[PDB]
Design a binder for this molecule. Sequence first.
Ligand SMILES: CCCCCCCCCCCCO[C@@H]1O[C@H](CO)[C@@H](O[C@H]2O[C@H](CO)[C@@H](O)[C@H](O)[C@H]2O)[C@H](O)[C@H]1O
Ligand SMILES: CCCCCCCCCCCCO[C@@H]1O[C@H](CO)[C@@H](O[C@H]2O[C@H](CO)[C@@H](O)[C@H](O)[C@H]2O)[C@H](O)[C@H]1O
Lengths: 459, 57
Amino acid sequence: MLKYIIPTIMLMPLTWLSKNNMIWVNSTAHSLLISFTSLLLMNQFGDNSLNFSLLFFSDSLSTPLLILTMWLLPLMLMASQHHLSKENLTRKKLFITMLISLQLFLIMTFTAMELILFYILFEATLVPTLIIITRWGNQTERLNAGLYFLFYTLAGSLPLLVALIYIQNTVGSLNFLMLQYWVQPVHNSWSNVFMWLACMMAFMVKMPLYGLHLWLPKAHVEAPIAGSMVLAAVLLKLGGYGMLRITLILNPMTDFMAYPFIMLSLWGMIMTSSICLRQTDLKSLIAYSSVSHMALVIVAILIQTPWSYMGATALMIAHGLTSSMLFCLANSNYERIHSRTMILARGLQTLLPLMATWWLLASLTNLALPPTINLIGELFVVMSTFSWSNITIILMGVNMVITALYSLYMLIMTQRGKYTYHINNISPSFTRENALMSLHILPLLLLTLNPKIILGPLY
Amino acid sequence: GWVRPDLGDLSKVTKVKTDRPLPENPYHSRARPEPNPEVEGDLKPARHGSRLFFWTM
Ligand SMILES: CCCCCCCCCCCCO[C@@H]1O[C@H](CO)[C@@H](O[C@H]2O[C@H](CO)[C@@H](O)[C@H](O)[C@H]2O)[C@H](O)[C@H]1O
Ligand SMILES: CCCCCCCCCCCCO[C@@H]1O[C@H](CO)[C@@H](O[C@H]2O[C@H](CO)[C@@H](O)[C@H](O)[C@H]2O)[C@H](O)[C@H]1O
């Protein structure tokens, strides 16, 4: 993985040694080159994972998440450089450095063989993410958003550390390849019940599980655009990736331990989808939309079927592009009217015809129109949970209806109707913004032609 | 015929021939506990290094 670690590290001297007016050009250009080389990780085999060294490996689960991570860095750079234009040069370079350091931790997190190494990197992502929100958010309550985000995580992550160290003592190793062969069944006991919860609750908070989700809308409303993009697209999936890995060593106890979380997820997805129908902050609506989509991922992971794991992988990738695109669309309006209130600026299709098309496409993928990979992932989960219990189709189907309702409600409210009379600063869409939207949706739709590369190891 | 010993004479250490056998265990000591086995051999590098969690050295 050094061919990705080192050039990512070199982005830092590139940014600091660039001419003052070239920092965005150079960092964007070279981060795109790193993203191109990331496609060499597609050398996956049917039986064995791609095991580079004693520290790093890449299977079909981590590879799509790696590609998404390195694709997202140039997009965040493009999305950030406008609202940071007045920032002084050193603080701009520090901002870009946080984004680069976030990529560094993320690609190492997704490729670590040993689970303590994954833990340290998994925890290290907190620092630049917290700094990005509290330093470069606009509003007063970004400070509280940082503390909620920080302490929700550490409330779950410290028990995980204790469990991980306990598991190594008992088993002798935390190398994930070793765990596949030395794994032993988890028998029933109160000790194993708390081992299970310690192994899982940290990832539940990240997803976030319904009932542990209130940090997320708080974080999004305060974060700058790049913060929301990485948070929605990658940082949530750290918990999804963590669960997909650690469930290996939790059988058969997951059989009955999953129930309360499945109930929270299955009911939570309806609750959060309904909440979206009444949200007045556009960013908060997209944040609640993520909670609803990630509830499906949690169910998929917990029921542990080949179909559910494939759906979970596709849903995680598909949501990452879709939700990141929606924050970018929401942010493009915000950079004109300086408000996140959804009802403030209406009828924008009359004023911004092509941005209306991007809104339309983002909404269509959000409601999982066939054959977008959004639907492929959702459909696979719906398929698998029906076998788990046929009654789940009722909650799955109802959630589909509500998702279509709030997705299109977003579109109708902001883009259709009459334009607000007094808002007279809706300038034409910039090339940067149109490129940013298209750099989300085009790869997302191209993945329809070859979905297999996002379906994960169970494919 | 008695001659008074000179200054320093009576503080001399002398030697006596005794047929009394030298005592073997005047302290009545028990057998001493056996020492811990002596650790020996050639020092080699640690097998795969420190082996601390993920470290490879
Ligand atoms: C002996 C062990 C130590 C090894 C050290 C090896 C590196 C030594 C570097 C010495 C040269 C430093 O160079 C000195 O700093 C920066 C970048 O270089 C330059 O000035 C900089 O200004 C801005 C950035 O703020 C940019 O336009 C650009 O990065 C550069 O022009 C100075 O004009 C130069 O005089
Ligand atoms: C959101 C959080 C969700 C939390 C969900 C909580 C699930 C609760 C699971 C309850 C079962 C716990 O695990 C249970 O522990 C006891 C330990 O005494 C085990 O039983 C053991 O102790 C009892 C003593 O009362 C003995 O009678 C029994 O012979 C012995 O094996 C059970 O074999 C095991 O089934």
